[model samples]
Target: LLKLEKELLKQIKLDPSPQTIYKWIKDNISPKLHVDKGFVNILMTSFLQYISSEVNPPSAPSKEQLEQEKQLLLSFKPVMQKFLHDHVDLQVSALYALQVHCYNSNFPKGMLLRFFVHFYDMEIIEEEAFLAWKEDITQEFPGKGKALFQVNQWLTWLETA
Candidate 1:
C-alpha cells in the first residue's frame, strides 16, 4: 500500500477510468488489511494501469480503420484492367484464357473485394428485355468477352465466380 498511494493519485488525475477501481480498493480494503488506513491508496494506485486498460479496452479496426479500407477499395480497378489488357491476348478468344490471365496477374484481396462489390453488383447490373435482346454496353466494347473490358459474354461467366 505504501508503495502505491502516489501512483493512484497521479493515475486518477490523469485518467478518469482508474477511479472506478480506485474507489473500490479505497472503500473495501479493511484497516487490518492495510496494516493502517492509508495502505489501500497505495494498492489502488499500484493497480491503476490494469484497471484503466481493462475498462476502456482497445479499438481494433476502429471506424477510422474501416473508412480507410473503403478508400483502399477504390485503389485498384485500373490495375485489374491493365493486368488483363497486358495478358488477355486479343488473338485468343476464350473465357478460360481470361481466367488464366487474371490468375497470372492477380492483385490484393483487399482491393479485389472492393472491385467485386462495385462491379459484381450483377443482381442490379443487368436490365429488362423491353428494348429487345441486344447486348448493350455503356462505356466498354463487346469483344471484351475474350476477357478484356469489352467482353459482353464474360459478364455471364463471372456471376458464379
Candidate 2:
C-alpha cells in the first residue's frame, strides 16, 4: 500500500491536474477498486495528501489558489460517479476514507469541511452515505470524532435540509 501511495504521488508530482489523476485512476486504479477493497483506503489517502500539499497555500488563500483547489476537488466528480453510481456501500467507504484522510493529514478544520461540502455538491457522496458515515463510531480509523465534529454543523444542515 505504501508503494502504491508513492507511485500515485509520483504521478501527481509529475503533473498535478484533475484529468491526469482521473485518467491515471481510470486506467490503473479502477480495475482494482472492486476487486481490492483495501485499495480505496490507500488511494484516497494519497489523493488527499496530494491535495493538501497542493492547496495549502495560505490561511487566507488568494482567488487563484481557491480556484486551483476547487478544480482539483471537482475533478473527482466524474470518476467517483463512474465508480460509485451503483454502489452505496462503496460510496460510504469512499466518504470514510476521506474522513480518515482529513484526520490523519491534520487538515485545517475549515478545509476539511470544504472537502465534505465539495464532495456532497459534486454528488460524490450522497445524503444517505454522509448520514451513515456520521453514525460511525468505528475504531478502524483514528480521529473519527474529531473529524466529524469539525463538520457536524454542516452535516446537520444537510440532514435537515
Candidate 3:
C-alpha cells in the first residue's frame, strides 16, 4: 500500500491512459483475496480522478462523446473484473468508487446511472452489489444522500427487475 500509493498516483497523473494504468496494476498489484484497502483507495482515486478530468461532460453529451465514454470505461474491464471477482467485498468498493467519482467530481446528475448500467453490462459490477449498496444509507461519505437520491428511480427499477 505505502509503496505504490503515491507512486501510482504520480504515474497515473502523468499518463492517465487506461492500458498504461492496467499494465502498472497487473505488474505490481496481484489479483488476490482480501486486497489491501489502501490499494483500493489509491486505485479508484487515480483512475476515476483522471476520467473525471478528461470526460467532464457538459449538460448533454453528444453521441460520439458517449461512445468515447463507454470505450474509456470499457478499457478498464480486465482490471475491474479481476479485482471485483478476486475480492468478494470489492463490489461495494467499486460502487463507492463510482459514487465518489460522480459526487466528488461533480459529474452530470444522471452520470451515476450511466456508470451503473455500463459496469453491469461490462460485468465489472453485479446487481447484487447495487442492492446491498442501496441498503447502505450510511452518512460516512459526503453527499451519500444526494448521490443516491439522484439515482433513486433507476435503483428502484433495478430492484424490481
CA displacement after TM-score superposition, residue 55 of candidate 1 (Å): 25
Candidate 1 segments whose C-alpha is farther than 4 A from its true place: 1-60, 85-161
lDDT of 1 by residue, 1-161 (tens): 44355555455446545335445445654535533323422332233233324332464235665555444323322322222232222112112222232333352233223323343342211222201112334423232333333333344455334
Candidate number achieving the greatest lDDT relative to the actual structure: 2
TM-score of 3: 0.80
Lowest-sum lDDT 10-residue window in model 2: 32-41
Measured with C-alpha atoms, the lDDT of residue 14 in candidate 2 is 88
Off by over 4 Å in 2: 17-23, 26-32, 57-63
TM-score of each: 0.20, 0.80, 0.80
State the displacement of the C-alpha of residue 71, model 2, in Å, after optimal TM-score superposition: 1.3
The Cα local distance difference test for each model comes to 0.34, 0.73, 0.71
For model 1, state the Cα shift of residue 155 in Å.
13
Judged by whole-model lDDT over C-alpha atoms, candidate 1 comes out at 0.34
Ten consecutive residues with minimal summed lDDT in candidate 1? 124-133
Residues 66-124, candidate 2, lDDT per residue (tens digit)? 78888876765675577677666677777778877777667554777877888778887
